[PDB]
Design a protein around this ligand. Structure first.
Ligand SMILES: O=C1c2cccc(O)c2C(=O)c2c(O)cccc21
Ligand SMILES: O=C1c2cccc(O)c2C(=O)c2c(O)cccc21
Lengths: 193, 199, 193, 199
């Protein structure tokens, strides 16, 4: 039975995301009220950046880490279809063409996560500092693992605006609910024949 | 499970698919169309039902269980304009005209058989069925309330209010009500000290 | 020069719409504050219902009554393209298949215009009354001009929900500005070569 | 004409296309791409510019002409969250770090050469050009402010704030400010008694 099952999926992700977050250095040292404000500011961008890198192994689809590999369908609203198209055009194919690595991707999420602009933060400035340390390390990594490509660090950071646009649309069209929840709903409805 | 109440809204889901199967001719449609028609109407169908069911109570919205929401909570939750919209546009109107259960059912069936739903194999048949339902609601309306010639048209003209109201009840700002329950949930997760043993 | 020119177009329509509105029986008898509240509630639906019936003479496009006949383009946002598609699927092809007539269409706009649900009305109830008189006449017309087709009156009224959805999207994606204003903007930009 | 001021925002439009033509290599792109790139950036480009230009004033936004908007009007107009967002997210930040005119220009050029704009014939070249601009902004940043290693990255990370802020400034609720000037305009139209002679 579908809806409760979908709630189970939401809970599982976002406990996982909070688990990832706990393992980032210095996130826990932050005031508790802060840690929440950051997770709420960033849950969508952090998820999309993940579902997108995973999906590198797939041609034309999104892959959920339950192993479900998801596609655009006929009866989707213009909006949902467009989010699919944007994930692939602006994120997955790029992460792919450049062969973005997991260290690099993790660093990007940590930068996304440590957002000094998130509203209500007790100390905005020491988020900015942690955001600076992370990206500084990411620069150094890029400059060492791939020194032939001097612009790679920037190219990574400049995927961040797109994450923002997509993150906003995904909030708008309920993209997560319909990713996790499309198959269980449609499949249940087919115990109506 | 224990902590999983409320997501038990598939009881509401179950009840709806059960009602749809009952409508004449619904099940004869292609199985994919049926799914489309339901994914498409589930929203207005529930809203239309809860609005009607609230006529029986002199204020507020009787969602279910006797679960009764009054203007104070909604406005507290920051969802005031939508509460008022449902009440002014639909519930108030349903009450003043005394929309009966049979009229509500027809409008609802008309909502289900919507021929503009995206992805339909057989739109033609869906319109055809809609015609059948409205032809009948008019026949019912002319017999039962002969004194109001304009009653049938009046019913169909609530359907625009319902459409706009439904689109509203799907905005994400509306759902993510519970600001104080969202932090509480994430806070319990963060305060969990599970990974403090690791050898 | 484009922008001022686009403003000129907006002004011209919506003075026209207000002119149409003045010619409807009993709109002017309404309190002035009311007449405004109705025009603001309905300017988009009233325009779309018009651009849509006009466009009956066109295959795959929208026709503006300046004679400009407009199409979907490559670089449109998913949203603008979808509005185009919805106008044709839900309005124009239907108005077309049934051969909706101008009397019938005018009656529909008058019903759209006299919206008792519009906020702030001094007397909501006498809008409802004028809305009732209009549709009552529309019923009679249909039942006389086309008595072979007994459901036509309803079929007309049941295009009204779609007008509502589309009207809302057109407000959301600035569809009017980009209808009147796409050609002048693109054409000006091409005095950059 | 006389009553048509303000729509005279193509002066602002003129100025922008003039600046774009100046950027190295912009005009070498296919003429359709240029139009796409501008239709796509015009928004963030103007916002980025007005935010920077406001650093020079100790509060508010200096749009142009010395046209100065302070917190009171915006909040009166009901556009407070967006005003604060521009000020907190961009203008405040631009001031604290002392973003100079050269840095602002680079970010702006980076915005113009955006390779995700829909409908581009030659996306590859657009990325290629973006690389050229950023490579340089970094070279400029490392020479001029050698003591801040993290300065370049800090600049690019305002670009997400700008993107979200731009998307906001295109919402229709935002534009249709002037509630009291909209009725006034329609009222003059309605009160016009022109069609009171007709033979
Ligand atoms: O439309 C609703 C609604 C729908 C489904 C579950 C709900 O809890 C609600 C509301 O609580 C609600 C509300 O509190 C105010 C206006 C509309 C609605
Ligand atoms: O971003 C704007 C803005 C942009 C272009 C013309 C304008 O008049 C404005 C504003 O007035 C404005 C405003 O008043 C508050 C926040 C952002 C903006």
């Amino acid at each position: 039975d579908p809806v409760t099952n979908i709630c189970q999926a939401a809970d599982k992700q976002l406990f996982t995301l909070v688990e990832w977050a706990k393992r980032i250095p210095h996130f826990s040292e932050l005031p508790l009220d802060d840690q929440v404000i950051l997770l709420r500011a960033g849950w969508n961008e952090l998820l999309i950046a993940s579902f997108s890198h995973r999906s590198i192994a797939v041609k034309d689809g999104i892959l959920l880490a339950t192993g479900l590999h998801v596609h655009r369908n006929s009866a989707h609203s213009a909006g949902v279809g467009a989010i699919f198209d944007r994930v692939l055009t602006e994120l997955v194919s790029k992460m792919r063409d450049m062969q973005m690595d997991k260290t690099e991707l993790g660093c990007l999420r940590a930068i996304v996560l440590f957002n000094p602009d998130s509203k209500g933060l007790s100390n905005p400035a020491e988020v900015e500092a942690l955001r600076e340390k992370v990206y500084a390390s990411l620069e150094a990594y890029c400059k060492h693992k791939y020194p032939e490509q001097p612009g790679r660090f920037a190219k990574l950071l400049l995927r961040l605006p797109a994450l923002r646009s997509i993150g906003l649309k995904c909030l708008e069209h309920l993209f997560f609910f319909k990713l996790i929840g499309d198959t269980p709903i449609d499949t249940f409805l087919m115990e109506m024949l």
